[PDB]
Amino acid sequence: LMKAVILAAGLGGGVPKPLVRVGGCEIILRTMKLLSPHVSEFIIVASRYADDIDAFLKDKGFNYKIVRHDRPEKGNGYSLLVAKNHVEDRFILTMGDHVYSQQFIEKAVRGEGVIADREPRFVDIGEATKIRVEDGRVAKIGKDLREFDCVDTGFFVLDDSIFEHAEKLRDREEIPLSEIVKLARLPVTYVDGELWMDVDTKEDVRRANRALVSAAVGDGFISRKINRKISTRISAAIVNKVNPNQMTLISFLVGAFSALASFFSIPLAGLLYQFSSILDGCDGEIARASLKMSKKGGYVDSILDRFVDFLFLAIIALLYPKTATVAMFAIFGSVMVSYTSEKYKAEFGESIRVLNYIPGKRDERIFLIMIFCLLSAISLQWIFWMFLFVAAISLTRVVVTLLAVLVS
């Protein structure tokens, strides 16, 4: 594993580009978290906001040091020159204002020289650093190139030979990192159609938010064809406004209130229940997109789910004791569905290695409950059939799952 050099000089909603938050995470922190397993030490080149960037990275638990220079207007190339003494052999060079998906960086750090993209999806083809290739090597570079075989992603894997070509321009007034790439005749590595972009406008942030969240999505039929399409739009909107823990609480409160909502108008309680089901997938989407995933959150979220599922069925039963005997089976089967998956992962170390095709997971189950709650206003006879239906599909899935593991 080598060293990585991140360049932050210019330009500057009042917040410096590396510290601008995209998808519930600041740009420079996202880069470091993804490069971390592949990198021994991080070298940041900062000028005006060096103190701000340094003060931010202190408790992040990363191995880093900031290299300062007070002359940012002489180009991105000079930022590279001043970092010469802090690197050895092979190293990584990336931009502080660029956003990268984990899929991109995995196919990046294995590359060499310039990382190129033959068909950029998320950036402006008009404004982009265009590259023409000859002999798998950079024959040209620029924003205005007429004939180009790929586009610069702002990611580079370089070596000690790059300083020799860089020192050649040391006496220039402005030293664009672009021109340096030409002289060195650098190898072109291809990573195409992945998620990468440069953040400039607050509009770019929103476009990136959607991109990261969309890329962040055991789903069932309802979850696939309905719930995920509603939740991703909500998540992308609140992605840097709300953190995964707050979303866990919100989805729990909505869910709990939906269970309480059966005191007045049960058919309404079912609608709110389905809406809580839609929301329940937001914290995961946010955590995945912000790289904020934590075992503690997954644990708590699952327990609150189990409590909401219960409170909803048990509150109906409190009002209608005739169905309370059937409620037992629905309630028990409801938890056992989750327990079968969870006991598996604890014991075998991995999730589920099976066929779906048997209803039903929480998403489908809740959806039917909503309908049966709607049929309630017509007739109270549909309640009993709800409890029995829930108990039927749950326990069946639980038994088949048990009967499946027996054979191995």
Ligand X SMILES: CCCCCCCCCCCCCCCCCCCC
Residues of each annotated binding site for CTP: 7-9, 17, 70, 106
Q: Determine how many CB atoms are found less than 10 A away from the CB of residue 371.
A: 14
Does 22 participate in binding its own copies (rule CB under 8 A)?
A: no
**Contact residues for 48 (Cβ-Cβ < 8 A; gap 6+):** 9, 12, 16, 72
Residues 281-340 that bind Mg ion (CB under 5 A): 301
By C-alpha distance, which of 269, 301, 281, 279 is closest to 369? 269
Does 395 participate in binding ligand X (rule CB under 6 A)?
A: yes
- CA-angle at 15, arms to 109 and 25, nearest 5°: 45
Does 158 participate in binding ligand X (rule CB under 6 A)?
A: no
The smaller minimum CB distance to Mg ion, of residues 120 and 220, is found at 220
Omega into 186 within 30° of 0, i.e. cis? no
Q: Determine how many CB atoms are found less than 10 A away from the CB of residue 360.
A: 21
Judged by CB under 6 A, which stretch of 49-57, 60-68, 96-104, 394-402 contacts ligand X?
394-402
Does 259 participate in binding its own copies (rule CB under 8 A)?
A: no
In the bound complex, what is the minimum distance in angstroms from residue 229's beta carbon to ligand X? 16
Does 260 participate in binding its own copies (rule CB under 8 A)?
A: no
Q: In this chain, which of 230, 250, 315, 405 binds ligand X, going by CB under 6 A?
A: 250
The backbone torsions φ and ψ at residue 282, rounded to the nearest 5 degrees and listed phi first, read: -75, -45
The smaller minimum CB distance to ligand X, of residues 39 and 390, is found at 390
DSSP letter string, 152-184: EEEEEEEETTHHHHHGGGTT-S---HHHHHHHT
Compute how many residues bind ligand X; rule: CB under 6 A: 13
Does 400 participate in binding ligand X (rule CB under 6 A)?
A: no
Q: In this chain, which of 144, 203, 346, 355 binds its own copies, going by CB under 8 A?
A: 346
What is d(CA 4, CA 19) in angstroms, rounded to the nearest whole number? Answer: 18
What is d(CA 343, CA 214) in angstroms, rounded to the nearest whole number? Answer: 30
Q: Which residues here bind ligand X, judged by CB under 6 A?
A: 238, 241-242, 250, 325-326, 329, 388, 391-392, 395-396, 399
Q: Which residues here bind its own copies, judged by CB under 8 A?
A: 295-296, 298-300, 302-303, 306, 310, 314, 317-318, 321, 324-325, 327-329, 331-332, 335-336, 338-340, 342-348, 398, 402, 405-406, 408
